[PDB]
Amino acid sequence: DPDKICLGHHAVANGTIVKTLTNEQEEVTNATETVESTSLNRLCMKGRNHKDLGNCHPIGMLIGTPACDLHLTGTWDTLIERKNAIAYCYPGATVNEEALRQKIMESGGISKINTGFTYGSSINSAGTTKACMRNGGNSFYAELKWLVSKNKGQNFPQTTNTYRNADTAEHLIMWGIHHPSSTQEKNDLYGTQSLSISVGSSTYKNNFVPVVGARPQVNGLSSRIDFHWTLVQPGDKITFSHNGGLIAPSRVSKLIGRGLGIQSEAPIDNSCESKCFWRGGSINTRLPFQNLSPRTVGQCPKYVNKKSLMLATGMRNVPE
């Protein structure tokens, strides 16, 4: 009998379920994901002046391990370390190792400056090894010299070598201590005298006594070349007091600017761009969260313990 005008809202038959403060099963018209569950298997170095190290380890770059020969210097914005990366041709490890890598990884580039260090000819600074092969012949860390006495058994001469920071930004000086397998080896290179190696700067003081005695064999060698390091401040000197058994720098390293360090196993792609990376590769989502890995680097969605958080982008769906 009477004319009518009706008010109403749209709907669909296949509507999405979301969670609210009250309902955990609330059905709505349209919704969207906020947690990214999908990764890229690749690193995305588009618009990035990046450097992939391959089997070169960041440390190796400053000391010049055979592998890192291509990575002694350069400028970039992204450093990419890899698994089992080689930093030590000759057995040993860097004291305060982790700290160094992290400093190198956050660095944007490497300059090298020469120490200039020269030694009297009672000393053999050309000292090479089988452990660090180069052109199918014995060689050493490019940025270090192996100092041994010229005449086998002769006591190593007391020397003093001192580097001055000529540049106006701080340099990173690296050196090594040699530990002999047995006193036979010790005396054959540095002599019977007990050795003491003193390093000094305005901000650094340290004494190193090489230790003799066998370890297990690694590449035919039970002897170790451990390395230490420090920053030398601009317009400052670092002095090397040694009786022998000091692996001396031929080169100080200078870390240029800053860059993003990605520890990954994934291949590069320069077609692809990103600001977020993890072991398993790149993450590009405009989304605000992700459940891939709590180990991310760069500008990244926050890791959450939720598979899915569905955000309603539409009204309650009430079906016919």
Partner: protein, 172 residues
């Protein structure tokens, strides 16, 4: 809902209505006909658009790695980091579970409102020339052609222009 309009006094929604969110259905002398209301349908969208823009964002904070994926980090410091992280990750899990849940509740009820808001807008137009049937329609107590209907949807309908005709049909 909060406003009772959606999943409330309106029995259900209109799968047919694909040209908007909120709309009308008149039946009169000339015969039936459906049409969506843009100005309200837009207000609800514009609001969700706005929700999404703010919600669908990460920070501009460049994070260095504090965990070596290949090397083994000191057990004391590593245990601290694991705890620091797991506690951060537990917050963001919560800060999100709540953000989405709350924003979902608000989105729903916001829609709910923009419906009631229409019903009330129209009720106030039809003044004394119609009556609420309780299912989100107005029984109009006068002759209302496709001209008169489009005048309601257009918010141009004038009660005084049908007022006497309606009031008489009502008291009978």
């Amino acid at each position: 809902g909060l406003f009772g309009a959606i999943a409330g006094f309106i029995e259900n929604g209109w799968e047919g209505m694909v040209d908007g969110w909120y709309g009308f259905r008149h039946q009169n002398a000339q015969g039936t006909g459906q049409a969506a209301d843009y100005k309200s349908t837009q207000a609800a969208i514009d609001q969700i658009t706005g929700k999404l823009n703010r919600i669908i964002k990460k920070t501009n904070t460049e994070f260095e790695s504090i965990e070596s994926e290949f090397s083994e980090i000191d057990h004391q410091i590593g245990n601290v980091i694991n705890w620091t992280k797991d506690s951060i990750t537990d917050i963001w899990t919560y800060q999100a579970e709540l953000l989405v849940a709350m924003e979902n509740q608000h989105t729903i009820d916001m829609a709910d409102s923009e419906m009631l808001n229409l019903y009330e807008r129209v009720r106030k137009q039809l003044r004394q020339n119609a009556e609420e049937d309780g299912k989100g329609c107005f029984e109009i107590y006068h002759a209302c052609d496709d001209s008169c209907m489009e005048s309601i949807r257009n918010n141009t309908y004038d009660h005084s222009q049908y007022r006497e005709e309606a009031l008489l049909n009502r008291l009978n």
